[PDB]
Design a protein around this ligand. Sequence first.
Ligand SMILES: *C[C@@](*)(O)[C@H](CCCNC(N)=[NH2+])NC(=O)[C@@H]1CCCN1C(=O)[C@H](N)Cc1ccccc1
Ligand code: NA
Ligand code: NA
Ligand code: NA
Lengths: 251, 28
Amino acid sequence: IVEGSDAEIGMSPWQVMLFRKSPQELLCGASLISDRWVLTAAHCLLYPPWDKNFTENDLLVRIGKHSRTRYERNIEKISMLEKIYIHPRYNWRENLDRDIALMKLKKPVAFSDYIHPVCLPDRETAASLLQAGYKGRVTGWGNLKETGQPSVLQVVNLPIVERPVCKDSTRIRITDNMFCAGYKPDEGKRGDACEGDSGGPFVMKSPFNNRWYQMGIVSWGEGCDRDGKYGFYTHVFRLKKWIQKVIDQFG
Amino acid sequence: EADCGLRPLFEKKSLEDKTERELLESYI
DNA sequence: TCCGTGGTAGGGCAGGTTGGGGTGA
DNA sequence: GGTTGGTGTGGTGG
Ligand SMILES: *C[C@@](*)(O)[C@H](CCCNC(N)=[NH2+])NC(=O)[C@@H]1CCCN1C(=O)[C@H](N)Cc1ccccc1
Ligand code: NA
Ligand code: NA
Ligand code: NA
């Protein structure tokens, strides 16, 4: 996260850390949606242009954390993965279209002050909140500049951007399965996600019921926090049926 | 889906984090 | 009105965990 | 102590 700030304790209790067992390295973010299911970005797991293809036994997830590195005794929870599901239409070459994955935990996790699931958006929530200008919130332990990392979890709030602006901002082919978010050069304020923040949730607070909903997954970008450039996120409401089916089919 | 979206240390105590208002004020 | 027949990729033209519908271009 | 213990400087920092 570039030009963000330290997170308050319990501020993003659905934040999840995708870790690799060996070598012990932090790969990405993810998010808690049930006591057994975590949602991350597909490219965190599978990215053939770098021969990345992680099995269920390659990885762990760490839930309830605040420190990036330090073991948070009696606070965090480490879980092994039962099964990984990648979106059948995920395009790792062209543009990370449908850059989404779901990971079933081997055993359900106990919620707490620091561990608690985020809601997925319905049609009404999505209609209502997915508008250019509205701000959401991105969290992660990814890098602070683009070429170090944070001591603890970082947060930033950034506005959703009009599609034509997002389209003009990159050379890359953009799908309606993704949105972009970030400040413009003339908005004064700054901020973006960066490498390592992938799979982390872009979230919005519903004025209708006070609940937080996950509208996006950190997918990609070009540099980090460059003027004229915006972070691209997986459009979660568009893929919610897949999310439903898989859960209901394999819970 | 039942308990979802409601942070134990914020919504369940009626406390706001420092900048969630920033988001809510952005809606228009 | 278009948004499947390979593509990220098998087998097949329908649907699956996938071709729906959305600030849709 | 802390977001969390104690034959308390590591097991995970200070
Ligand atoms: C895997 C994630 O950590 C990471 C998120 C980067 C977000 N950056 C900003 N500024 N919000 N994603 C990536 O690094 C992706 C995956 C592989 C390459 N990549 C990029 O962002 C490229 N710079 C752009 C890109 C390349 C190929 C296909 C799509 C996008
Ligand atoms: Na930017
Ligand atoms: Na197909
Ligand atoms: Na200690």
